[PDB]
Structure 1
């Protein structure tokens, strides 16, 4: 009812009341904590009986936000919604409700450290779309708008909500822009190893792969439960940064580059019990995502060795910290490169400090701020960023982004 969190570096204490409005499973029980499990665990469409309570709850809070709680607008909306559910077994969100819900799902995303930006989100209503070609057009405009010549702008595009589960819209890509990965007969991997399965699907659908280290994957788009269709994103819309280093003249010879726009397209947006299974959203990068995870995870581009080599690092024993030494210079290269090309990026120190400031303001004005420590803390230099020493509470507020099965595991073909 009045849960306290403490910062162990500053001794600031915060009081959380917002946790009382939480709902869905964390995955934890009184006896077991799952806060490091990645995701705790078709038919999934709700009844009329399940829907109105969820809908009423979301409408009640929308109206509470606009300072109209209990108004005649509020009461007619509740009636309009209840009646629409009763006669059509679902309901449609006003455009105002759609924008509020998108922004609040971002605000409520406990694993997201950049939520200080949550209310500055551009929302593209794509609920009038009916085909895969239409989807391709809607996504291109999103990419072009969000990219903005390097001055990135947060955005989400929202396609039609689920109905009976059998007519879903999906983006089969997990992100709008990612690089292919090709496994070789000899077990080696060309390109990004994370993407080998999906690259294989693309090729199976007719994609002619150029078979390179940095090939942009086609889009694979599903409208109204139909089979998905392929579309090349027009290359002039895919902004890319070549990775050089302020001090090492040789770093450019590593031939590394990355795309500027991170855009998640495999999650599911829940608003008032309604499920938007295709809602690609996009922000700008924290530098550690590229330089620590994409380049350095052993199951990703795995360049630590090569960088280490060119630094002439003693790689005999681990205790030389040759990996730690090499990772820092990679992450210096990535930030310096985006900055040099005026492509929006944020470093892990700036980003985490901003988050603490956000979290503190959310406690003051909203009464809480659910945060997943295991994801908020950056994957390098942890304890020298302020979030490490920050106690956080994790709970699920709705509206929310949620994981959903991979469409190729669920879709039934024709």
Structure 2
């Protein structure tokens, strides 16, 4: 019931006690592990609020104090009266940083405390959402010296007035089905691109067309906005040794910014909460460029390298994969856009994990997501046992809005 995790490369063992605060369910049971599955009233609210407020006032060394008891009473009053309640700015900031701290699938959590929280709970229209998101983008991009940030829109009330960003990320490229049968652009985004065209977007039908924002305020129908082109920092991808690489026409955007998750704090739900940091190189070069269901350029790069593509055992896919990922890091570094390589990021996560066990009693971590999608065992996270459990505050998945929105 108190748990050990071993690192099999260094022989270090850590003792996890933080998991005994787990509040949500994992999807696993004693008979079956689901660790690789991508997606496994007033009475409910006050215990949720009490538990968050208890950890908040414990974190500020004011547990059981007058201010603690007074807030507890005031929140209790507000829930009986107004069915819900509002977070103080300090609680909102704490709740947001801790949601990131608790994100077991995130390798970049060594940075969790330096998050810039933008309170957008005064937003009332989709036009306001767009201004708040443009400012987020500009602040976070910061001319390429990227800064972590989240923008928090008004909390769910009765579920019929949700704020939602319909895009999965603030910045993504469109995908179009060709009459051909092939796919132009990002195949991950074909459906959402269809909804943009359905809502009236004029698609350039290019290969790297930054999608528009589809913003929903107060449960209203979503509206379309285009991020100002000069706020979208992009990087042309070249290779430090292959002059021909630039001829592939590849570029990627600088800012990874997740916009479709749900932030839970003290039982309150923030259905629109875009957050951003900076890329790990392999997110672009391994997944975006080489997934079969994405831009899928492995074959092309390998042909320009003149590799023996007859047999898998020449490892031509592996060789091209390394080169694509060399180019991605070289291009971002050359253009002075913040990026981290998977060796640096995983080494940082180990230091962070040690810090969390030492100062917090544990660190929930999902090995399937923490280990990078290339060169797994030469990063130190590969040899690190990890316990996965669900702490709150938390980022959570939510249904795509077009499947739930009454139009």
Is TM > 0.5 for Structure 1 vs Structure 2?
A: yes
1:170-203 CA-to-partner distances (Å, cap 9, x unmatched) read: 0000000000000112211000000000000000
- The alpha carbon displacement at 1:46 in A equals 21
1:109-156 CA-to-partner distances (Å, cap 9, x unmatched) read: 000000000000000000000000000000000000000000000000
How far, CA to CA, are the matches of 2:139 and 2:224 in structure 1? Answer: 22
How far, CA to CA, are the matches of 1:46 and 1:293 in structure 2? Answer: 22
How far, CA to CA, are the matches of 1:66 and 1:212 in structure 2? Answer: 52
Partner of 1:258, secondary structure, is: strand
- The alpha carbon displacement at 1:23 in A equals 1.0
1:63-89 CA-to-partner distances (Å, cap 9, x unmatched) read: 000001011110100000000000010
Structure 2 residue 30 is matched with structure 1 residue 51: no
* Contact 2:254–2:278 (CA under 8 A) maintained in structure 1: yes
**Map of 1:97 onto structure 2:** 91
Structure 2 residue 397 is matched with structure 1 residue 412: no
- The alpha carbon displacement at 1:3 in A equals 0.2
How far, CA to CA, are the matches of 1:118 and 1:368 in structure 2? Answer: 15
How far, CA to CA, are the matches of 2:204 and 2:2 in structure 1? Answer: 58
How far, CA to CA, are the matches of 1:121 and 1:85 in structure 2? Answer: 29
- Alignment gaps of 5+ in structure 1: 39-44
Cα 1:333–1:80, aligned 2, differ >3 Å: closer, same or farther?
A: same
Cα 1:123–1:260, aligned 2, differ >3 Å: closer, same or farther?
A: same
* Contact 2:27–2:40 (CA under 8 A) maintained in structure 1: no
Once the two structures are superposed, the pairs formed by residues 316-331 of structure 1 within 5 Å of their partners are 316-331=310-325
How far, CA to CA, are the matches of 2:61 and 2:331 in structure 1? Answer: 45
How far, CA to CA, are the matches of 1:47 and 1:30 in structure 2? Answer: 32
- The alpha carbon displacement at 1:231 in A equals 0.3
| Root mean square deviation, CA, Å | 1.5
How far, CA to CA, are the matches of 1:202 and 1:19 in structure 2? Answer: 42
Structure 2 residue 354 is matched with structure 1 residue 360: yes
**Map of 1:258 onto structure 2:** 252
**Map of 2:197 onto structure 1:** 203
**Map of 1:397 onto structure 2:** 391
Once the two structures are superposed, the pairs formed by residues 206-225 of structure 1 within 5 Å of their partners are 206-225=200-219
Partner of 1:401, secondary structure, is: strand
TM-score (norm 2): 0.99
1:238-270 CA-to-partner distances (Å, cap 9, x unmatched) read: 000000000000000011000000000000000
How far, CA to CA, are the matches of 1:72 and 1:156 in structure 2? Answer: 31
How far, CA to CA, are the matches of 1:255 and 1:185 in structure 2? Answer: 22
Cα 1:46–1:310, aligned 2, differ >3 Å: closer, same or farther?
A: closer
1:190-237 CA-to-partner distances (Å, cap 9, x unmatched) read: 000000000000001110000000000000000000000000100000
- Alignment gaps of 5+ in structure 2: none
- The alpha carbon displacement at 1:341 in A equals 0.6
**Map of 2:101 onto structure 1:** 107
Structure 2 residue 70 is matched with structure 1 residue 76: yes
How far, CA to CA, are the matches of 1:242 and 1:337 in structure 2? Answer: 7
How far, CA to CA, are the matches of 2:352 and 2:313 in structure 1? Answer: 38
Between Structure 1 and Structure 2, how many residues are aligned?
407
How far, CA to CA, are the matches of 2:50 and 2:98 in structure 1? Answer: 16
TM-score (norm 1): 0.98
How far, CA to CA, are the matches of 1:73 and 1:402 in structure 2? Answer: 30
1:303-351 CA-to-partner distances (Å, cap 9, x unmatched) read: 0000000000100010110000000000000000000011000000000
Q: Displaced runs of 4+ in structure 1, greater than 2 A?
A: none
How far, CA to CA, are the matches of 1:87 and 1:184 in structure 2? Answer: 56
How far, CA to CA, are the matches of 2:81 and 2:146 in structure 1? Answer: 43
* Contact 2:17–2:361 (CA under 8 A) maintained in structure 1: yes
* Contact 2:263–2:395 (CA under 8 A) maintained in structure 1: yes
Partner of 2:110, secondary structure, is: helix
How far, CA to CA, are the matches of 1:343 and 1:185 in structure 2? Answer: 37
Decide which of 119, 124, 127 is 1:125's aligned counterpart: 119
Structure 2 residue 157 is matched with structure 1 residue 163: yes
* Contact 2:173–2:211 (CA under 8 A) maintained in structure 1: yes
